[PDB]
Nucleic acid binder design. Structure first.
Length: 850
RNA sequence: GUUCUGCUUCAACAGUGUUUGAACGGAAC
């Protein structure tokens, strides 16, 4: 029973069936001071309290965040949903399919087996035949399981849009309202925190654990509050703001922490801006950068097609539980761990040049700075030209017209794509500037080499939907060697001509031999300098050009404010962008409960995990006279345990593949074979860099002690299982460190390994092993292989008691009479339960077949 | 000797990207 059910009440009395956990009633004093990001964790634990996977001390720990943040305590995080990128969800769907077969064979309803939460299979990357089977398998899954949706290949290939498309922000499901939140096997997951949705990327195994009902374990984080106030000056672009906030966070030191935004300034950042910041958190090391749901967010939901009524209810919910943000109201502000601040008036627009991308010069100083460079002695910021020559200039004819070319004249104005994701808005800004310039009679001298290659992507929507290309075209910028006259005037006058470039994508690549000076600036600034034809200008007190009719026009007259840009964005660009997606998804899923495993397949196979699984729990079996399969040292990485990349031709995996009619050229990678336990098991400990102490040298092998033969690890393990010998692995410190490897636990399980004895375990991996039924043993403080004399050739016996207690001590008796203690590393009752059930998957099977 | 090319590794930052570079792995002759 949920001890906090008394908090559940109807959001709207006219709808008794739709409830929400009123966190306000839990403890208003501490709740109202909590960072909004932490509130999402809180609500999640509270609604899922089950006195087991999520205990009430857990809810207490989160609620007491202000204090606990400093005691490094583990709390559970139960996401509202999961995202499985590309084909990373194959092993997971295979487990669930195999789990259904398992429940069938026990006389139960297979359909009782299903992912606890919604899962979105996002296969949006852009050999198609190489993935056909795996694609097919996941498609079957989307139909066989509930709440399992799929974004197929050949539809939305603009990731960002797909993620926001899948963002609920607030769930209205099974009679409850709760905040949207997730974890995905997609590194870009953190991007969605810009829209108020808490979440980040995790390992494949952790994602599956979520699908199995297991919370992500995590240290209650500190929360750096980043405040935004003031207004930015006129020429300041989104990228300027983003890079400032981004670069700052890096220095502040937020690695391992949460970053939550606030201050009246947040109201000035569009969802696109927020998403860009959140998405770059890997760069500054934060776990997540959260932007509470405010009116901007809500309005964004409408812009994407969600309907008014639903959205209105979402806001009502957020206001009721106290998770709706009003950045203008300081009284609402949380009690952050630390506060960093940024006055937008502080950001200063700049250009880089005239020779190095590192040499920054404020836009308002371009004139002075350039004129100083003319004098200065030939340096990175000097061309040295006889003081009299400064005001030089020659003339020339171009297309039956005359033009003068003074020093600092602009001959090239090229706009290219930026890698930074806030570029789209900035490009739109460049366009809106064009429109206003054209409307004001301005133009760009014909001889100026002007180009525009925005690249592909989201920017396309921003240009097209805003109907700005016509104007950009009129000024010489159309979607994609200077005139002979110009090159002559430059050289004949021995002039320092200028090139203006937007986009960081390669600098020295287009530095014309004729452009002695070159600057990097924002897209709109490029166009501007092209209208002005020179950088020796002071935009504050100098016309961009005299109206083809009467008066003069100033830069300030045609430069779009961030608000104007955001207005065009929200009423034309975003709506269009998402309409196209609902469609590309709808019409593509149209061309279409137990899995019919194909024996001829080499990509999908039913795992052995549940052979002879009995509905009743049998008492734990001791490990008797086991043999050590591998005697390892320190820092054995997950990639050593389960390698990534291609398959060696001299491997158990290769032989297996050969024996089935496959040639080397068609083996593919271990990664691609994750849905076939046969190949993955054969790849366990197949890393050529493996350093087995039994051999004192890098080799994917071990000694089959009975024979003394040295075979590839899998092979030795096979033999051992045939002979009926239990197996265990010895290891040094930090066992299982390294990046996520889907089979780092399952592989060892299929090699017959019943236990591991290490000096130290990397947190996650230890958990992964428990999950698969494997026993993690740890030497007592101070002891290890050498201390104890262990050679790895003795036969090990470990007698497990039926009354196991967390971190209990057990004896290990060798067949040489020797004896010693070790810690059986099951850290919690949940973990003990998985052990008794033989693993988390097995536990799930029993809980369902009733 | 030539050519083609990952649940990889490492590095860089006009600036974090379906980025750039390098390494290793893999395939073919």
């Amino acid at each position: 029973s949920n001890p906090f059910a008394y908090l559940a009440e109807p959001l709207d009395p006219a709808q008794p069936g739709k409830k929400f956990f009123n966190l306000n009633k839990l403890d208003y004093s501490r709740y109202g001071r909590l960072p909004f990001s932490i509130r999402v964790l809180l609500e999640a634990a509270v609604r899922n309290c089950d006195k087991f996977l999520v205990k009430k001390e857990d809810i207490e720990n989160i609620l007491n965040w202000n204090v606990t943040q400093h005691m490094n305590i583990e709390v559970p995080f139960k996401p509202a949903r999961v995202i499985l990128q590309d084909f990373t969800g194959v092993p997971s769907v295979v487990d669930f399919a195999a789990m259904r077969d398992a429940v069938k064979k026990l006389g139960g309803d297979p359909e009782k087996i299903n992912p606890i939460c919604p899962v979105d299979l996002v296969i949006d990357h852009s050999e198609f035949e190489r993935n056909r089977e795996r694609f097919e398998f996941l498609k079957w899954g989307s139909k066989a399981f509930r709440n399992m949706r799929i974004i197929p290949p050949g539809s939305g290939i603009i990731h960002q849009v797909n993620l926001e498309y899948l963002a609920r922000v607030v769930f209205d499901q099974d009679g409850y309202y709760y905040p949207d939140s997730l974890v995905g096997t997609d590194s870009h997951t953190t991007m969605i925190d810009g829209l108020g949705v808490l979440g980040w990327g995790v390992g494949g195994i952790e994602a599956e654990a979520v699908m199995l009902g297991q919370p992500i374990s995590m240290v209650l984080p500190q929360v750096i509050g980043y405040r935004l106030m003031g207004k930015p000056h006129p020429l300041v672009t989104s990228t300027d703001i983003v890079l400032t906030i981004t670069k700052h966070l890096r220095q502040v030191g937020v690695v391992g922490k949460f970053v939550e935004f606030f201050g009246p300034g947040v109201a000035q950042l569009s969802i696109a801006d927020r998403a860009t910041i959140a998405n770059m958190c890997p760069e500054y090391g934060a776990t997540a950068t959260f932007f509470p749901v405010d009116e901007v967010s809500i309005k964004y939901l409408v812009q994407t097609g969600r309907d008014e009524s639903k959205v209105k209810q979402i806001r009502k919910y957020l206001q009721a539980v106290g998770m709706f943000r009003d950045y203008s109201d300081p009284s609402q502000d949380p009690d952050f761990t630390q506060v960093v601040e940024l006055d937008l008036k502080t950001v200063v627009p700049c250009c880089s040049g005239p020779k190095r991308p590192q040499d920054k010069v404020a836009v308002s100083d371009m004139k002075k700075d350039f004129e100083s460079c003319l004098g200065a002695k030939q340096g990175f910021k000097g061309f040295q030209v006889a003081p009299d020559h400064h005001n030089d200039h020659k003339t020339f004819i171009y297309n039956d017209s005359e033009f003068t070319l003074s020093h600092g004249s602009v001959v090239i104005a090229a706009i290219t794509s930026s890698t930074n994701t806030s570029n789209p808005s900035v490009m739109l800004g460049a366009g809106l500037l064009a429109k206003k310039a054209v409307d004001a009679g301005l133009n760009v001298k014909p001889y100026v080499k002007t180009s525009l290659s925005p690249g592909s992507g989201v920017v396309t929507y921003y240009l097209r939907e805003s109907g700005v290309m016509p104007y950009l075209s009129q000024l010489g910028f159309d979607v994609v060697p200077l005139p002979e006259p110009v090159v002559e005037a430059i050289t004949q006058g021995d002039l320092v001509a200028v090139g203006v470039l937007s986009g960081n994508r390669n600098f020295e690549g287009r530095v014309h031999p004729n452009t002695r000076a070159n600057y990097l600036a924002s897209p709109p600034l490029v166009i501007a300098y092209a209208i002005a034809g020179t950088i020796r200008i002071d935009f504050e007190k100098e016309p961009l050009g005299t109206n083809a009719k009467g008066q003069q026009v100033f830069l300030r007259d045609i430069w779009p404010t961030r608000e104007e840009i955001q207005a065009v964005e929200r009423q034309y660009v975003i709506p269009g962008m998402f309409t196209e997606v609902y469609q590309k998804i709808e019409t593509v899923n149209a061309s279409w409960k137990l899995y019919l495993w194909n024996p001829k397949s080499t990509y999908i196979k039913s795992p052995p995990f549940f052979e002879n699984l009995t509905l009743d729990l049998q008492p734990p079996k001791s490990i008797v006279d086991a043999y050590v399969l591998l005697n390892l040292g320190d820092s054995v990485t997950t990639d050593h345990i389960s390698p990534a990349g291609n398959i060696a031709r001299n491997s158990p995996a290769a032989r297996y593949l050969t024996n089935r009619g496959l040639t080397p050229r068609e083996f593919n990678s271990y990664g691609s074979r994750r849905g076939n336990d046969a190949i993955m098991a054969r790849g366990t400990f197949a890393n050529i860099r493996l350093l087995n102490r039994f051999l004192n040298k890098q080799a994917p092998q071990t000694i089959h002690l009975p024979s003394g033969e040295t075979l590839d690890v899998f092979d030795a393990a096979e033999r051992y299982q045939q002979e009926g010998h239990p197996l265990i692995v010895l290891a040094g410190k930090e066992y299982g460190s390294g990046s996520s490897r889907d089979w780092a636990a399952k592989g060892p399980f299929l090699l017959g390994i019943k236990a591991v004895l290490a000096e130290s375990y990397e947190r996650i991996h230890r958990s992964n092993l428990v999950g698969m039924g494997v026993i993690p043993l740890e030497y007592l403080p101070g002891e290890n292989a050498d201390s104890l004399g262990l050679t790895g050739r003795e036969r090990y016996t470990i007698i497990i008691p039926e009354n196991l207690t967390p971190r209990m001590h057990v004896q290990v008796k060798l067949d040489t009479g020797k004896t010693f203690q070790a810690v059986i590393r099951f850290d919690t009752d949940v973990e003990l339960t998985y052990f008794h059930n033989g693993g988390i998957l097995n536990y799930m099977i029993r809980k369902m077949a009733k």
